[PDB]
């Protein structure tokens, strides 16, 4: 006899973060083999086509008319925003830094070049 008793395990390749879900920077929204979902707004894409969040926000799945026949995952900076954002409106940006109210810290920062 000779049996075909050999197989790899399942690659855990679902969506790891869902519509309306809060995200943090670096977090993986999708694991996939090839771009089933394309990286949308405020979202990066890795070597393994893994969509990850570039900013803190709300994970949103959407279609964009500019790219028909392509699904997108992006991160809205608030829950208020429809994440296929209006084209000619200005981009919702995050400053994401804090001023150094502390005097010593500010001085150190000024010194550093």
């Amino acid at each position: 006899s000779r049996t075909s008793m050999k197989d790899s395990a399942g690659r855990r390749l679902g969506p790891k973060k869902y519509e309306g879900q809060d995200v943090s920077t670096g977090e993986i929204i999708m694991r996939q083999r090839g771009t089933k979902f394309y990286p949308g707004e405020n979202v990066g894409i890795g070597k393994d086509h893994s969509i990850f969040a570039l900013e803190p926000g709300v994970v949103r799945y959407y279609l964009d008319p500019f790219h028909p026949k392509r699904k997108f995952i992006g991160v809205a900076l608030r829950r208020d925003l429809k994440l296929p954002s209006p084209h000619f409106e200005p981009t919702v940006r995050r400053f994401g830094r804090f001023e150094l109210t502390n005097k010593r810290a500010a001085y150190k920062e000024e010194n550093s070049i």
Binding site: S1, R2, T3, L63, D64, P65, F66, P68, K69, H87
Partner: protein
């Protein structure tokens, strides 16, 4: 010619599966298409082997060949390759070797069809009864006026079921993808896509 022995280039073993109980009301291959009289399954959905089908065909032929311009349309092909282990062997230790070809036959499906120039219906009926005596199901004579079997105890006329243009229906109640495409086609996106 090849209905009882398919010529798949890459011959391969197959899982057992199940005979499809067509819960949605299929009526596909459950209608007289080629001939005047036919033989349909009447019982529960069943597997018919290649050999059995061949024997049924042969039985039918005895009546068909004497006819002027006599014809037999074999409606189903034995597409599923069945392997078997021996009764001699123990359980486990791989899968058995190829044995025969077989077809999964839903409840309502037509198996055969005939039409001669000088074919009286009684003779055809007799032939089909004799064909049925060799097959594992319980079978039924079907004429062009006789209506389509769906369930075990249920019936249907295809003439009744409605005609629909599905593009129009889609337009009425559109999917998200379709809407996105339509938007893309519009000028405020098509001009500024910048490819």
């Amino acid at each position: 010619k090849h209905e009882y022995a398919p010529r798949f280039k890459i011959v391969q073993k197959k899982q057992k599966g199940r005979v499809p109980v067509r819960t949605g009301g299929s009526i596909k291959g459950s209608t007289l298409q080629f001939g005047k009289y036919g033989l349909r399954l009447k019982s529960e959905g069943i597997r018919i082997s290649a050999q059995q089908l061949k024997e049924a065909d042969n039985a039918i032929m005895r009546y068909v060949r004497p006819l002027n311009n006599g014809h037999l349309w074999r409606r189903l092909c034995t597409n599923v390759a069945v392997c078997i282990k021996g009764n001699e062997t123990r359980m486990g230790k791989g899968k058995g070797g190829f044995d025969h070809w077989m077809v999964r036959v839903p409840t309502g499906k037509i198996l055969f069809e005939i039409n001669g120039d000088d074919l009286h219906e009684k003779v055809a009926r007799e032939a089909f009864r004799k064909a049925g005596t060799k097959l594992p199901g319980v079978y039924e004579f079907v004429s062009l006026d006789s209506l389509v079997r769906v369930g075990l105890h249920s019936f249907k006329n295809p003439k009744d079921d409605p005609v629909k243009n599905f593009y129009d229906e889609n337009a009425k109640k559109p999917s998200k993808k379709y809407l996105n495409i339509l938007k893309s086609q519009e000028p405020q996106y098509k001009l500024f896509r910048g490819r």
